[PDB]
Amino acid sequence: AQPIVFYDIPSNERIKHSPWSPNTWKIRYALNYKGLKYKTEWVEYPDIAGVVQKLGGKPTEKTPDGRDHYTLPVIYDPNTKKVVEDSAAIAKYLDETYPDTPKLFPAGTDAFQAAFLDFAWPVLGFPVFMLVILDTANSLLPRSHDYFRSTREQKFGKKLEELATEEEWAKVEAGLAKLKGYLDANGKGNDLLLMGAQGGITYSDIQIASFFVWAKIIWGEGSEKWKRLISLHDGKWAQFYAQFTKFEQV
């Protein structure tokens, strides 16, 4: 079979040109975990809309003014001749199109995952975003930097330099405390995956891991910031995240 074409956002030498996006990483994870062959095409932030339109793909939401908003990840599957957008929809497509691969949406879990996904950004991803947003912008190629900084600063009404605070660190920890609580409901020995030790990795687990790999890559694995995040709750997150390192092929 031909490699799926995977559209991702590039980076500069600060992070050695590593992919970095929490949103595209969900799909890089899905592909690596499923053992599917793919090739990465690199698209700068301001070129996303153009590229996706030229592919025949669709926007995934609308900006506050009401304009179509195009996002990555997007894939083109040469085996089905289909373009697929929106990370959750892409993961589901992968399950359905490649049924011999491990399922990210086991039967009976779709609505539960939809709900979990809907709260992952407010409770965890957004506070993390604030802690990594400046270093993210500085890891972008020049044209991406200008688009990202201008649009994100416009959005939050602050310079990117003002967003990371200790209050955001408290929000991250509080969000991870909630998550630890949910995982605790599975019982001892089953509290490192949402569906338990023998449940396997779901799309929802990947969503949490994608927040971690984002922070790790942007901050640096040898950094103190990374060490601070990963050390919370007595090293629980180091254990959780360590489950995903085998699936970080680039």
Strand runs labelled E in the chain: 4-8, 38-42, 61-62, 68-69, 74-77, 82-85
- What minimum distance in Å lies between the beta carbon of 235 and ligand GSH? 28
CB of 93 to ligand GSH, least distance (A): 12
Cis peptide before 102 (omega within 30 of 0): no
Among 46, 59, 102, 106, binds a second copy (CB under 8 A): 106
Record the tokens describing residue 7, joined without a space: 């559209």
Closest CA to 241 of 250, 231, 249: 231
Closest distance to a second copy from the beta carbon of 27 (Å): 17
Segment lying near ligand GSH (by CB under 6 A), choices 68-76, 96-104, 175-183, 219-227? 68-76
The one of a second copy, ligand GSH, none whose footprint includes residue 181, by CB under 5 to 8 A per kind, is a second copy
Is 72 a residue that touches ligand GSH (CB under 6 A)?
A: yes
Q: How far is CA 77 from CA 30, 38, 231, 244, in A?
A: 14, 9, 39, 24
Query: Scanning residues 139 to 178, which ones bind a second copy (CB under 8 A)?
Result: 178
CA pair distance 34, 117, nearest whole angstrom = 20
187 belongs to the binding site for a second copy (CB under 8 A): yes
Write out the residues near ligand GSH by the rule CB under 6 A.
Answer: 9, 21, 23, 45, 48, 60, 71-73, 86-87, 151
